[PDB]
Amino acid sequence: GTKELKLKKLSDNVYQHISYKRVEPWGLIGASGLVVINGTEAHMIDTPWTTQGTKQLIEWIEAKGLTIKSAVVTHFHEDASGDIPLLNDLKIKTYATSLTNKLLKLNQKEVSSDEISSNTFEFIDGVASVFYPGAGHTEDNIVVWLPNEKILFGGCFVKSLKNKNLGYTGDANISEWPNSMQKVINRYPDAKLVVPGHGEVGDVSLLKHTQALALSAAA
Numbered sequence: 641g642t643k644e645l646k647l648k649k650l651s652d653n654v655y656q657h658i659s660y661k662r663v664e665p666w667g668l669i670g671a672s673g674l675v676v677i678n679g680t681e682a683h684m685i686d687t688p689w690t691t692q693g694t695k696q697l698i699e700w701i702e703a704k705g706l707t708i709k710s711a712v713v714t715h716f717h718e719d720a721s722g723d724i725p726l727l728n729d730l731k732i733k734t735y736a737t738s739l740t741n742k743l744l745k746l747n748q749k750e751v752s753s754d755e756i757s758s759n760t761f762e763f764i765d766g767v768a769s770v771f772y773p774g775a776g777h778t779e780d781n782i783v784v785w786l787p788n789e790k791i792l793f794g795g796c797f798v799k800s801l802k803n804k805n806l807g808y809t810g811d812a813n814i815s816e817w818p819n820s821m822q823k824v825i826n827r828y829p830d831a832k833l834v835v836p837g838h839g840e841v842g843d844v845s846l847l848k849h850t851q852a853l854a855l856s857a858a859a
């Protein structure tokens with residue numbers, strides 16, 4: 641890959657995009673989203689962390705001859721929603737919940753072109769569903785389920801196993817996070833792969849691990 645963007649194949653139709661940003665004292669650290677390929681159409685789950693990441697990702701997808709039909713952003717932070725303005729200009733439909741758009745507007749950022757106004761939403765017909773579990777990392781965080789591959793994109797709602805803490809909790813609801821996570825655990829007993837917003841992909845233990853971190857941060 642490059643200094644800004646790496647692509648990892650997760651299945652025949654599913655890629656992990658890993659975009660890099662210098663965050664001292666760590667150096668270049670990564671944020672994860674997905675590209676979901678549905679015939680000649682591609683869909684973005686989260687934008688890369690930097691505009692240069694997003695431009696390189698749009699180039700990689702288009703170089704396969706695919707049309708980027710749409711993007712869904714999984715929360716209002718820059719590592720999920722950062723390049724809404726670039727996608728809106730390129731006329732790539734952006735989907736965000738009413739809560740995500742409220743927090744983008746509160747923070748003087750451009751809202752999505754298209755608003756999710758239900759707790760569950762068919763993002764790609766038969767391929768990608770959005771679920772709002774309640775507050776955790778942020779008030780607005782959503783997860784995306786890929787039923788064909790048994791892949792759950794948890795985003796920054798889910799921590800990697802190695803994480804000893806919840807990360808940036810400035811926008812978090814630590815008391816609600818465990819109950820929100822129980823709804824995700826209860827909903828996807830069939831999840832084969834869980835993709836956190838940062839860190840290594842894993843199994844459902846990442847859900848239980850995040851719930852435990854939240855229960856401990858509360859106590």
Ligand SMILES: [Zn+2]
Pocket residue numbers: 715717719777796
């Ligand atoms: Zn975040």
Ligand SMILES: [Zn+2]
Pocket residue numbers: 671717719796837838
């Ligand atoms: Zn994040």
